[PDB]
Enzyme design. Structure first.
Site, PDB file in Angstrom:
ATOM      1  N   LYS A   1      46.618  35.259  37.180  1.00 30.86           N
ATOM      2  CA  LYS A   1      46.912  33.821  37.295  1.00 30.86           C
ATOM      3  C   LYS A   1      45.648  32.948  37.071  1.00 30.86           C
ATOM      4  O   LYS A   1      45.319  32.071  37.880  1.00 30.86           O
ATOM      5  CB  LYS A   1      47.522  33.499  38.670  1.00 30.86           C
ATOM      6  CG  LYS A   1      48.839  34.249  38.987  1.00 30.86           C
ATOM      7  CD  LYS A   1      49.477  33.720  40.316  1.00 30.86           C
ATOM      8  CE  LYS A   1      50.785  34.481  40.627  1.00 30.86           C
ATOM      9  NZ  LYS A   1      50.559  35.888  41.029  1.00 30.86           N
ATOM     10  N   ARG A   2      44.951  33.172  35.958  1.00 32.76           N
ATOM     11  CA  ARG A   2      43.732  32.395  35.682  1.00 32.76           C
ATOM     12  C   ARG A   2      44.072  30.986  35.250  1.00 32.76           C
ATOM     13  O   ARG A   2      45.196  30.738  34.803  1.00 32.76           O
ATOM     14  CB  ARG A   2      42.883  33.090  34.608  1.00 32.76           C
ATOM     15  CG  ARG A   2      42.459  34.504  34.991  1.00 32.76           C
ATOM     16  CD  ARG A   2      41.856  34.607  36.352  1.00 32.76           C
ATOM     17  NE  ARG A   2      41.091  35.867  36.499  1.00 32.76           N
ATOM     18  CZ  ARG A   2      41.138  36.636  37.586  1.00 32.76           C
ATOM     19  NH1 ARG A   2      41.941  36.331  38.605  1.00 32.76           N
ATOM     20  NH2 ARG A   2      40.376  37.703  37.664  1.00 32.76           N
TER      21      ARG A   2
END
Lengths: 289, 289
Positions: free
Chosen positions: A100-101
């Protein structure tokens, strides 16, 4: 014949093995004392994942690794992360790096290099779209080549979703603005299967909403992060599938810890992970009418 | 001397050393051949960072590390990351782990463990609030103890901010819903300085907006991710400070690569990083009337 695009490979895998995604969100706390005896943190985590993979590779479509668990163990955890991913890629198996960057431009290009190449190479990653389309655009270089996919946060089932995701924008929830932008991006890359490689992370919220999201985004694969233990929960998961495909449903702890429920479990970690993975698929499918 | 809480320590560092944040977003591409010759990736990155740190520690308040750069080099990169953070701590200097993590609940607790303890321990992290208050709340266990802080994404100056951050909710930008929630949480932990440890990431957009944001969130420290080269850019950054404090301004590549502009740069990396760090403070402070 054999699928070329990674989204088509995943569709293939779901058709053959079912829609279960096994979440190797591994902790030393989950590992039998006899299996961690004598091992470093990196050796123990890898050996435990391997035991699970070997018994489950044909009863799930894909494995997902919540990288936070590996980062929590520092360098030893990252070594296990690398070793697990390498093992998956050797066995012809698919992986999602659940990272989940959030970054854009050059920093996003560095995450793309981090997670689509080298030590931490995965087939798909999860992305947070908060910063806008320039948090997704830098990954297109990889997606366009056909071998890498993404799942973009849309609507999750946690209580915090009520804080921001659902806020009204022009008469409809905020998250639809995000979804519709990914939907038009996805159209550039549709595979043989009728799905593209730009997917969404979608939780099982409630009936009306899961049907609306499924229908609105019918050419994108859904990563379903998990589900609860009640009857409405598995029905809602079922409703996020299209013909038992078009989505994968993650299960982590139930699978990783199932051995703890059986007297002979310490010797059968992989067997009991397998038993749960099968049960999960059967549970969800039984909603078919 | 003196300050106990980490936000008051940052306030004091800005007071003594000015508001520059040095961005150790390091790449093998920025290192002179003579410095990386004979070194592994982890050794080269760390040696380079040390050289910069040793010459700049009294001309910046804090160092920020964009973890994506380190993740891009796999295990070797994570070793240099570990070593850099440890050295900073050894030297009584402050760090920000620029990780912009997104997860909730147990995965957020794993990220807190990862980045506030052990190998990757830092003093502050960046966080993405998309998933809601349960993406911030799990870090409070650490923030409450006084030693750790966070910077939460609010409004950034990239083109993508126009996609989602600025969408109207109840007649003003979406990001104000986020900032207002963080403001209320911040109040719980105000330090002796008048600021609390729950800060915001705020880009220098345009005059009217930077003024409005600075006033609305007057007890929160701002992390300013960077700024462009035009006159208006330095003034907008200046407008995000309160009495030359209440914020730090990041500069990464200009500092890291300044040696490249001088014939004798190769043996003077730290010297030219120092030159640029000082010039950065001057460019911003020149706007004070």
């Amino acid at each position: 014949s054999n699928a070329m695009k990674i989204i088509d490979k995943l569709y293939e895998k779901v058709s053959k093995n079912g829609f279960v995604c096994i979440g190797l969100d591994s902790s030393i706390d989950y590992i039998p004392e006899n299996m961690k005896a004598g091992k470093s943190v990196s050796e123990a985590l890898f050996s435990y994942n391997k035991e699970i993979i070997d018994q489950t590779y044909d009863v799930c479509a894909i494995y997902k690794l919540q990288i936070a668990y590996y980062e929590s163990y520092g360098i030893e955890g990252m070594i296990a992360y690398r070793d697990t991913l390498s093992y998956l890629r050797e066995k012809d198996l698919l992986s999602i790096g659940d990272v989940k960057r959030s970054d854009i431009a050059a920093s996003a290009k560095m995450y793309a290099k981090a997670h689509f190449e080298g030590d931490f190479e995965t087939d798909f990653i999860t992305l947070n779209p908060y910063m806008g389309m320039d948090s997704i655009e830098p990954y297109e270089e990889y997606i366009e080549k056909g071998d890498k996919g993404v799942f973009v946060l849309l609507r999750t089932s946690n209580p915090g979703a009520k804080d921001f995701e659902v806020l009204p924008v022009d008469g409809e929830e905020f998250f639809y603005k995000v979804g519709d932008k990914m939907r038009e991006l996805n159209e550039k890359y549709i595979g043989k299967s009728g799905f593209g490689p730009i997917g969404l992370v979608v939780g099982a919220t409630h009936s009306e909403e899961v049907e609306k999201i499924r229908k609105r985004y019918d050419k994108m694969f859904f990563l379903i992060p998990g589900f609860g233990a009640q009857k409405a929960d598995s029905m809602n998961v079922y409703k996020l599938l299209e013909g038992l495909n078009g989505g994968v449903v993650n299960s982590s702890r139930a699978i990783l810890k199932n051995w703890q429920n059986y007297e002979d479990g310490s010797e059968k970690v992989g067997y009991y992970a397998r038993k749960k993975a099968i049960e999960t698929y059967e549970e969800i499918k039984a909603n078919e009418v």
